[PDB]
């Protein structure tokens, strides 16, 4: 596990929710798409988006 600096985007890949992460102290070239279950709290992203 690595510290997440920011969540940049969200996509659904055959039912499966993934998010585009910037990792803290790594450049954008290192950004990755991660399945939701790789995050400690994906609910915070969902709650943020579903409230608009």
């Amino acid at each position: 596990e690595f510290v997440v600096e920011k969540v940049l985007d969200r996509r659904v890949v055959n039912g499966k929710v993934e998010y585009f992460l910037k990792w803290k102290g790594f450049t954008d070239a290192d950004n990755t798409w991660e399945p939701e279950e790789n995050l400690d709290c994906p609910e915070l992203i969902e709650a943020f988006l579903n409230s608009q």
Partner: peptide, 8 residues
Amino acid sequence: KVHRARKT
């Protein structure tokens, strides 16, 4: 807080 996640 500070969050962490598994990287692929």
